[PDB]
Amino acid sequence: DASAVNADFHFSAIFQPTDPHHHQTEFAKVEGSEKYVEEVEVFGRQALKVNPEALTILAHRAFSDVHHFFRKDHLEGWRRAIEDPEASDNDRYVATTLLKNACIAAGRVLPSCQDTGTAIVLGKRGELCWTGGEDEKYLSKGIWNAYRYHNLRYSQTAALDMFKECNTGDNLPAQLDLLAVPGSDYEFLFIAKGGGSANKAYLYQETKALLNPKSLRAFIEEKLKTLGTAACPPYHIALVIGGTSAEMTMKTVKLASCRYYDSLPTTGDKYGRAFRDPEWEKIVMEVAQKSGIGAQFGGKYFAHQARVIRLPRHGASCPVGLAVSCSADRQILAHINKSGIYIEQLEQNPAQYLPTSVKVDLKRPIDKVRQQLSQYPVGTRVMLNGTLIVARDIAHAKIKEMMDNGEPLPEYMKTSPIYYAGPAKTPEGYASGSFGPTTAGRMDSYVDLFQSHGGSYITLAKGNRSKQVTDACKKHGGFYLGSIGGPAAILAKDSIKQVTCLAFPELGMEAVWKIEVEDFPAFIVVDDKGNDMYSKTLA
Template sequence: MTIDYTPLLPIGPDTTVYRKLDTDTIGTFSAAGRAFLDVAPDILEQLAFEAYRDVSHLLRTSHLRQIAAILDDPESSANDRYVATELLRNANVAAGGILPMCQDTGTAIVHAWRGQQVLTDRRDAEHLSHGIARAYTTLNLRYSQLAPLSMFDERNTGTNLPAQIEILAEGDDSYRFLFIAKGCGSANKSFLFQQTPALLDPANLLDFVVTKAAEIGTSACPPYHLAVVIGGSSAEFALKTAKLASAHHLDSLPSSGSSAGNGFRDHDFERQILTATQRLGIGAQFGGKHFCHDVRVVRLPRHGGSLPIALAVSCAADRHVLGKVTRDGVFLEQLDTDPARFLPDATEVLDHDVVRIDLDESPAQIRAQLSAHPVGTRVSLTGTMVVARDLAHAKIRERLDAGEPLPDYLRRYPVYYAGPAKTPSGYASGSFGPTTAGRMDSYVERFQAAGGSLVMLAKGNRSDAVRRSCQAHGGFYLGSIGGPAARLAHDCITSIETLEYGELGMEAVLKIRAEDFPAFIVIDDKGNDFYHRDNRTLLTIGAAPQ
């Protein structure tokens, strides 16, 4: 029997521009008429170390060009341009190699394809992990990985390990890698929808995909690289393909399928989805056109009774870098070391209509000033804030459950949901951007009823329960730009001290002073929500840009 075989994901030639690492020479030898590579353990360790060093501070030139293009688009909103400028400023600070571009320096994920003529000691994942741990322990990165000690007890590993490492056998005499630093904000916005073949209708499928994309909201730091996978031999393969596509790893797939069942990109459907997302009105976080930089749609074969659909995004911290080991040496993708050239010449137009808030005034005075302005107003915050996020909120709720009062610091100061990276020598703090607000939604009503968390600062949209609580208790939610963590640390955070729960590391309760910290009024004390104006959500297909 003859079959028409083709790989499930037939990727085209690699056109990446690489830089060569200064490492030991790759050993080679011949046997049974074939040439083999002998890859020593320190080669893998050094490759992983340099990959995670580079990807924590540098971006691809293509990504930077897409951010800069927002500034040149006459259809961009003022807020689109403001967010784009902040992201470029952040890239410029991060490129200095001291402050990482995002405070969530991510879960280390390695996809690797080892050729049959590449020999190692078979402990590849261990050697790669050594390099990853060296990057996270010696650079100004953050430890985010929690080891489960029991079903309900966890402890930070202090190395950011374990990494997710997957090595497949593919190819001949080369070893190829895709290194990813995946923050939880964008990782949490990977979704699988088990649908039926009835959805395979052009209008219905477009409506479904764009609706689900809109529901991602802004908490994962748009503008996004959105990946959509239609079909798949299994649920897990659909999700994996979406992750690879969001990293642009599948850009060279063919543009049509075949009877053999290969996956392909649908460029027309990509354009339709991108156009539809531009009409949502969400924009680059605070209203406008640029919710997505681009869209990748991959169509896969499927079982006749199943239609998995997977969505994934890569966020403002688009952290992916390719590597390879060949007979010619060890190579990493050349990321962009000069993002400053993309910065606009002048930004004074972006600084109009900013309301300056003194956070050292009384809580009542702060809220009275915020109450005088509508949602969507851009504010500049100067003064004292406390920092608390998931684990600190859980511990404070335990105190309330035990009949103890809310800590005074949550009554006195605005609360910033964040968890900084390590502080470099000579700096006030490490990279210090906002975390996703929605993870703290379940605490808000309880804390506000007790007189605290009446001014909250984080990123992304929030639930209707938070809006109702703010209306009932006179509270406010301020949205900061998701993404520019290095710039905030460099330009806005002037001091930091631990108030409580120091054992939680980056999740401790902190007290910080800020200068000209940028934010927007998202939810006010009257029950208005920037993302749900006049009972008409911005997250609705066809809404006009604001």
């Protein structure tokens, strides 16, 4: 029957930010850009004409500025990570390491991170914003300019078929999300999203049984360990409870990690509105600090901050989104209006935020090095000096085809440790472009096979690894060293001296490189006995 029914109709938008036009953000205008606009009035309504050339130009300051600078809230976290008495020493060192990288990047020659990311555009074209309609082509051109004329990295791999792939050669196409919105302006958020943090976007399908403090707290405790250290913490953690579909939930959790939703309300209503959840944002941070995971190597600063947005849901549904912003916190707001192009101003003076080292010579027989490494327990910090072999997914895959017919393991797979990494482009007159590690766990499947054929005894990367790497190292007497994640520019400037392609030339950044390093920082993570320095915080 009808007795709990209702009455009149009231539209309430799901997203109701209190700062819809991002007035809380400081913007700078692109000089002379009033030449791109003309005030008109049509059918009694005011409209705005935009030269589509502006999109290439606009997308190119944003996708240039953003690879060298961070937002103040990211930077405040780094100053804070150093000054907190409760931060571990390793937090401070990593934050110091991360802070030193950011200072190098502001020189505009070396990019702040090695993984210069996927180019993502969120666009909102006003009803009366007239661009000529070629928005997508010109925006893609601006990213291309940033990536063609600067020392960034091409990270996107096109699939010619299921297994045959080729590089696009310019890190294009971009993700262009152009939304239709009210008004006559054009608003943008540009995001250069690292693959590592894009990969740390997880979807779980849960139920109402989850929606209680005890279960949800336990869920967050349980699931946070699965984020690990593989996306260069401190993290901005975003958690989205509810959503009208998985993809909408994941888009929402993506933007929260990007602080796009910071000005939402903090209470729900009977009409179903998004809200920020301060209590559960606080709860996420409490879990992060007590987790002991720390800034890559143990401590309190697993996370800068957290955003938790509660959304409405279908009775049959409970989508949940979890996503991070990484150390390379890279986003930029902008808008176009009758006065021209305005672009979020980032902090040009990072300096106000500015406040165990055992040398291991790798230029020795690897058997002497294995013996020395075998002398120390996991968690031991080290500084590496000598030759590294650089190889990641495609180089591993190329190496795997030889290995797949059961013999021989190529000799070049047996002489040196395998460094999972991919460098950014080398600036003119510089020895190396940005060059930090990439997540070890993704190459985990190659170690046991290679070790069983007498190679890949030592691997070097970032991120927690699977039991197979621990098991492999214990059986064969191997070691895994973790470089600091994020400081790609200062490693290249001070530590990385030469890069040459060794194998698989047809590949791009994913070829095998041979490099010689000095003062390369790492921790002994896995020893030759079954030990793993993450076994307590990451099980």
